[PDB]
Amino acid sequence: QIEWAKARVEKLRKRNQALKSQTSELQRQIAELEASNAELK
Amino acid sequence: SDILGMLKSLHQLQVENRRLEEQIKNLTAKKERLQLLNAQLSV
């Protein structure tokens, strides 16, 4: 079914966007910690 | 057959999906090490 195939693409596209946005937030927290560590050193 | 185009789209998304989960694991592992160093310099 085209619709079934279309929907697997959509769902996994949505999921990968959630992962990319989770990586952005992880990157920002890592920047917060590496700045704080540099300051405390 | 009629779905070869979307099947190939899904295939690339499946490869990218595994790269992103692996990358996240490496970033949370890093964050934990940076969190332990921040605690040692803090307390």
Automatic annotation (TrEMBL), chain B:
<feature type="coiled-coil region">
    <location>
        <begin position="3"/>
        <end position="40"/>
    </location>
</feature>
<protein>
    <submittedName>
        <fullName>MLLT10 histone lysine methyltransferase DOT1L cofactor</fullName>
    </submittedName>
</protein>
